[PDB]
Amino acid sequence: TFISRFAPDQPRKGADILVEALERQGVETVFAYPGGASMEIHQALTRSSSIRNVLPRHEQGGVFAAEGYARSSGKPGICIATSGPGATNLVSGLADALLDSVPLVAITGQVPRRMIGTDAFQETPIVEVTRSITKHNYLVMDVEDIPRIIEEAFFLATSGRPGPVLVDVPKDIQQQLAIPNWEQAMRLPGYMSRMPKPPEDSHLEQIVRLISESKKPVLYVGGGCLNSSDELGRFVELTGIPVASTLMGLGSYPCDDELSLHMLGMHGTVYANYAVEHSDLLLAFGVRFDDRVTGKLEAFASRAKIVHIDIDSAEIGKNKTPHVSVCGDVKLALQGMNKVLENRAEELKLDFGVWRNELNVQKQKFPLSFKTFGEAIPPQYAIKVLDELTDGKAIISTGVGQHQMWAAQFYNYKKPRQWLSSGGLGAMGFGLPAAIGASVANPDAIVVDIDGDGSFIMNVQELATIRVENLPVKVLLLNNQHLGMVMQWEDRFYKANRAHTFLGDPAQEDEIFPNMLLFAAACGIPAARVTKKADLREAIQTMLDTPGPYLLDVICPHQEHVLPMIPTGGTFNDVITEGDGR
Amino acid sequence: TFISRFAPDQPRKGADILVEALERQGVETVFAYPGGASMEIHQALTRSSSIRNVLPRHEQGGVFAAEGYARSSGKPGICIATSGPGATNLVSGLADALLDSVPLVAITGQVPRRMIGTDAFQETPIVEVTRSITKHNYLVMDVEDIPRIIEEAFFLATSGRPGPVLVDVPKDIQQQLAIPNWEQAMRLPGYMSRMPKPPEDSHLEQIVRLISESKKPVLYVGGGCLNSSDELGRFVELTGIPVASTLMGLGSYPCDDELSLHMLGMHGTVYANYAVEHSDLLLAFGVRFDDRVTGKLEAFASRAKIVHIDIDSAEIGKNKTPHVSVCGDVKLALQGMNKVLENRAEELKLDFGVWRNELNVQKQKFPLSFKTFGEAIPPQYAIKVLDELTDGKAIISTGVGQHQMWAAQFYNYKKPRQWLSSGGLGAMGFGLPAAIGASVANPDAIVVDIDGDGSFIMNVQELATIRVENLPVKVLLLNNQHLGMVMQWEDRFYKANRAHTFLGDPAQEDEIFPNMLLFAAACGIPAARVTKKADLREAIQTMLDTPGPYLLDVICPHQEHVLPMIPTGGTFNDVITEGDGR
Amino acid sequence: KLEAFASRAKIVHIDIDSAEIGKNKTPHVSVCGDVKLALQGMNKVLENRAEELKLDFGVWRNELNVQKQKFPLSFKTFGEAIPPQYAIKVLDELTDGKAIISTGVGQHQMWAAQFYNYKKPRQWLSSGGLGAMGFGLPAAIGASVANPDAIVVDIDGDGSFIMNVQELATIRVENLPVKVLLLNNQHLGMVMQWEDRFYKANRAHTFLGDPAQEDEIFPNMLLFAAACGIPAARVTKKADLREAIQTMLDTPGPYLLDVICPHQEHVLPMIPTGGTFNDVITEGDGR
Ligand SMILES: Cc1cc2nc3c(=O)[nH]c(=O)nc-3n(C[C@H](O)[C@H](O)[C@H](O)COP(=O)(O)OP(=O)(O)OC[C@H]3O[C@@H](n4cnc5c(N)ncnc54)[C@H](O)[C@@H]3O)c2cc1C
Ligand SMILES: Cc1cc2nc3c(=O)[nH]c(=O)nc-3n(C[C@H](O)[C@H](O)[C@H](O)COP(=O)(O)OP(=O)(O)OC[C@H]3O[C@@H](n4cnc5c(N)ncnc54)[C@H](O)[C@@H]3O)c2cc1C
Ligand SMILES: Cc1ncc(C[n+]2c([C@@](C)(O)OO)sc(CCOP(=O)(O)OP(=O)(O)O)c2C)c(N)n1
Ligand SMILES: Cc1ncc(C[n+]2c([C@@](C)(O)OO)sc(CCOP(=O)(O)OP(=O)(O)O)c2C)c(N)n1
Ligand SMILES: Cc1ncc(C[n+]2c([C@@](C)(O)OO)sc(CCOP(=O)(O)OP(=O)(O)O)c2C)c(N)n1
Ligand SMILES: COc1cc(OC)nc(NC(=O)NS(=O)(=O)N(C)S(C)(=O)=O)n1
Ligand SMILES: COc1cc(OC)nc(NC(=O)NS(=O)(=O)N(C)S(C)(=O)=O)n1
Ligand SMILES: [Mg+2]
Ligand SMILES: [Mg+2]
Ligand SMILES: [Mg+2]
Ligand SMILES: [Mg+2]
Ligand SMILES: [Mg+2]
Predict the structure, then answer these.
(1) In A, residues 496-535, which contact C (CB 8 Å cutoff)?
(2) Exposed e or buried b per residue across B13-46, where buried means at least 16 C-beta atoms within 10 angstroms of its C-beta
(3) Which residues of A are catalytic?
(4) Which other chains touch chain C, taking contact as 3+ CB pairs less than 8 Å apart?
(5) How many CB atoms neighbour CB B102 within 10 A?
(6) Which residues numbered 43-82 in A keep a CB inside 8 Å of some CB on B?
(7) Which of B337, B62, B367 is nearest to B217 (CA)?
């Protein structure tokens, strides 16, 4: 039974209805930045004793913090901004949440309804702007529509395929007095009629029948299995099928397990891409067949019967036509198949040891490799030390670039929602704010931001947010003085012609620029720099043991390349296995 | 005669056609951030010996730098970004350039044409997103359309009412070989037919006739007069009409002149708002009648015959119907009226000394005032010292907030394009990157960023850009540890209830947080902090005399309020003249 | 009701539009491509592996042949009044089923689909997705131009025919052998049928005649054809129906045959909107 701060017959401001609408949704943390259009909302937030606001230093850091809050907990992330410039700073976060299917609810202030369309002070048509980069958006035109729209916003953002939902609230609606009606029915008739239903037994028995008829099955797990870690693990025990995860599906099946093929795709392991290339049954659970995994669609799984399970009917058959399809929750599809695989266990006699040994041979001949040059710190080795010292139980958020791939390859994630990274949009500056949202949603957890010197500096202002909110956010900065991912593509396909990829100072060429330690010192965050490989283990241990925030500037040779690499539009026969920029 | 780097019959990449198309437009400086979708453009930029790229540390800093480059020189500002997250970071700059009518050309990379709409890697419909926040945008669908679209983009961005134009270029178009045709005719038939024509003599003679019949005339000058400083000054000599400028029109008529009423509007001087309130002829030259100037439209210039000259026919009569209107360039309208005012000089016998003395009395009784508390530095006084030590010849870029208003009130700008500020959108984090673009376009000029502690930290990463490019950018940081503008509205209309406006550390409440000096030290920029009013003059002098970049952390008491203040929707009778937060 | 449609069947969906596969119902096996090529590929497998598969569904066909004989398409004849179903059945016989049929929208559209045996595709031109009235007469114009040596017949309704009646001038000027089998029931029959079933026969602007002269055929469609110089005739008795349709076919050039039908007829069978197979209506009309 919800206990309101107002009487059921007492009129209250629309902003007070908005905050209470969040309280009735279970919202405990918002990321709001104040402004003229949203001052009424911020005043109403102070009256709430259950909703905590984490003030960022940039609205892009506020929406990215809402993503990490959502990616690391399954709950929806709520960010609030003002009209005009405050709303336009959320654009990168909204498009990022849409491509990665992150439940998010963004509330933006707006000019009064009478001033909309008049080029008013700090007015931008944020609904027209964000319609193509959000799952759905609203423009509240009456104070009585607030309880319904907020309920519809959280329902659309969390149900089906999750995504961001923006709610634009004009200022005159926030100030208008009204008595809210919390019993209104949602006006989503076509959406609810198209919601997926529990999977039929005829579809599940046909999948189990294809498993027994197959000799080389491979599991294709992605971001749709973040809530099916137990169901997927039970499915692997009953089948013994090796698991290949996407960049979004890391942690769904433990990377340290013997049946794990780790990541597949452009920068996936050689044995994971080998398994899909020479498979006869591809179980695509919670994936969307991105070109980062398939490359050339004509050659991707060219000899496999494709079984695609997805909660979005628009994804089934988009880039590749499957043989058997199941539109619904992969969590329920696994539960239904586990019952069939257990009763009919001895009837099926499932054993793929011959196919697994074919992959174990490929795993031992082409494993993830990194070369150590003298005392220079290998970035792959540094992340491998972080795995050991944290026992693989740390929540990892990353930026975008070479460090993002090495953090995915050389860290064994035991559970999903430990791996927070921008995969669909690939937005730099995501690592640091996402670690803020993850640390708030998981206070007793080890949160480490494996960031790059280019991605870290984009939202470096959020270091002040970490200090003020006293969050134990660790920053494992892999500094290579370059935009490493773009630098790698210059060495491979452009004759190493540098085109504005060096991030240091050309005057003092051999000086670490910028001095990231002074960035942490400016915000009162203890920091240290490590350059020699021998001092690396003690430095990372000091970062973890030191209470509160900590930044570790790890210097790495910039000539390193992420391996292996399948060029864009290439096949498995075009995989690059060796080479760098020396 | 343009000299190309390729033979007229030699095929070249589409990216090389794009860069040469910029060279043929006179482009010398671009602000490009590399990415997978725009690597071909960056490779082609290195082959250009005339186009210099200023690499920012954030695309929002790149587009804001393109604004300051344009606002301080009249030339169009060119910023380049990659697809997906790089393009979405330009959104705040595009909407800011549209509301302030800043000529800007944004070039964004895009996924290959075959992959558009497939939720590809780093794909966002940037044309669908930015259609409502740009003057016009394009999606290049063929390599042969590059010479025409670039010519149309620069024409639309600089002609008529200036604005931002976005050009989305897919990657396959950048790589395709072709022979460019630089003789293509622009396909803008309806736009050129609607372009304003030179003003007719019948309209100009009717304006001059209303000037002689009026007794209390007031000039209403705005951002449309940035290229008419000489024509406007000549017009004032022949009429003796006092000049009231908007936040965008500062510098058009010198603030130090005796005939200048300084700024009008919400935070405009009392005597400027008094002149418009009690006028019989309002000469609105290059303005758009924003609610920040009018307030309540029914009471704004309620006794004046309104003469509105504007180059956009959609602005004439939008918020207020004028008596006489002239659709065209205010530069030509002033030239035509100056000829009539000089030949018919003794015939008209123009003299408004009685009306000017009525305003001089109001100027002496209600001037711009600030109170000095002990040795605490008044933010108004610090800007007044910067005016004296720079002789008013410095290019000033500001953020948004209280410091933005004090930099407009207490600095006498002698020429337009010395004042770079976000007025229409009012985007924080604009001051520092705009100073970068202004310093590049004006290397031998004094560029000072009067920023606030909240606005400065949003794009603090651009300090690395200032050091690498070795730009003599001065940062006069008015630090009040608060979001001062929002804090002021809390004291006035919300009983001083703080709602997430304090930017410091609540644990160490009386400690300056963050330590902005260490931000400059991280990027190798000399910095210093001044707290006592006596040491203020020597500190600002050290900032100016020290070559290269410099940051001056000026500590100010946060209880200061921007005065005077006309509340939203109020009239001249509701102006607040005294009060603060003590 | 999608939940009950083919509730016990493995659905195999072949379609050239990937957006249609799995939209309203999820199939077990899907093939995105041209069904023409999919049939060619399956025919080769079915012929080589013919004796290996031993395909025989005579037991399932006999189960349907029993249902076909107990519930066939039925129409009732009332005295000498012309049954609209019978008139279309006569047109099938006199044209040997080789005529190109274009229809409007309504009851006449359904009877032209039920009681005519089309031997080849592209003989049946009708608005199904949008269901636009006034489609029959102009579509017969385009079909007669694309197929000059073919028998083109417009099975139109009095409401649909009048919407684009101006195209009769186009038929005469272009000299097109367009036959108009007008099933005149003086009503918007399809909307009238739904009034009798679900609205207690409360007429809501469905009568197309003249209420002053209630028992007079209004409008006189014969004078519409006469205005455009098209020979026309009206038939009311069932005995004169066979000779009237034969005169329409044998007369060269355009021809309009005003076939008067009792308006109380209903299109059967009928499954109500959102219903299942257990809700099929098999008998009943408006008498
Ligand atoms: C620099 C860089 C390099 C990259 N390289 C790689 C790479 O080498 N390999 C790689 O895999 N990725 C890589 N990516 C990431 C990438 O572009 C995509 O995010 C990824 O390839 C696709 O993730 P996904 O298949 O799991 O689909 P997601 O984006 O995770 O979407 C989930 C899918 O499952 C479905 N779904 C969601 N919820 C449910 C549910 N409850 N039940 C059933 N279905 C559900 C959704 O409809 C959707 O189709 C890279 C990214 C970057 C920035
Ligand atoms: C915190 C804050 C407080 C503010 N308070 C104030 C305030 O107290 N006072 C104030 O004035 N502003 C204030 N503003 C700024 C503000 O919101 C608007 O930018 C400003 O009020 C309107 O500027 P403008 O009238 O010059 O029109 P602009 O935005 O400068 O547009 C120029 C106008 O002239 C026309 N034009 C352009 N070129 C030509 C040409 N060549 N010939 C003829 N016409 C042309 C255009 O069509 C357009 O209508 C504030 C902003 C902020 C962020
Ligand atoms: C907002 C934004 N702007 C530009 C981007 C285009 N990209 C990249 C990519 C993969 O998206 O290329 O398509 S990666 C990259 C450079 C990474 O700098 P680092 O942080 O130092 O990481 P590292 O460990 O050194 O490699 C750029 C510039 C991007 N994604 N986001
Ligand atoms: C991207 C962005 N986000 C939020 C904004 C909403 N606003 C403001 C306003 C006027 O737009 O209110 O409508 S001003 C302001 C706070 C100014 O912090 P400061 O830099 O310290 O300046 P000061 O000298 O102390 O006053 C905010 C939060 C904004 N405009 N831009
Ligand atoms: C342009 C147009 N306007 C109105 C229509 C709505 N409908 C119908 C329907 C099925 O679409 O109802 O949804 S059928 C119909 C009446 C048919 O008049 P008839 O020609 O005399 O045929 P009959 O042999 O008597 O039954 C109407 C009014 C329509 N489809 N098209
Ligand atoms: C807190 O700082 C400021 C500053 C400022 O101008 C200096 N004005 C305001 N307030 C309004 O503008 N109210 S309003 O007129 O209803 N708007 C158009 S809105 C919805 O807020 O964009 N707050
Ligand atoms: C430079 O860093 C990277 C990284 C990376 O993935 C790790 N891929 C690429 N290149 C492409 O993606 N080419 S592409 O396939 O034509 N694109 C979809 S696009 C237009 O570039 O977005 N560059
Ligand atoms: Mg930033
Ligand atoms: Mg780097
Ligand atoms: Mg401040
Ligand atoms: Mg489909
Ligand atoms: Mg009818």
Answers:
(1) none
(2) bbbbbbbbbbbbbebbbbbbbbbbbbbbbbbbbe
(3) 59, 121-122, 171, 485
(4) A
(5) 26
(6) 43, 45-46, 53, 55, 57-58, 60
(7) B337
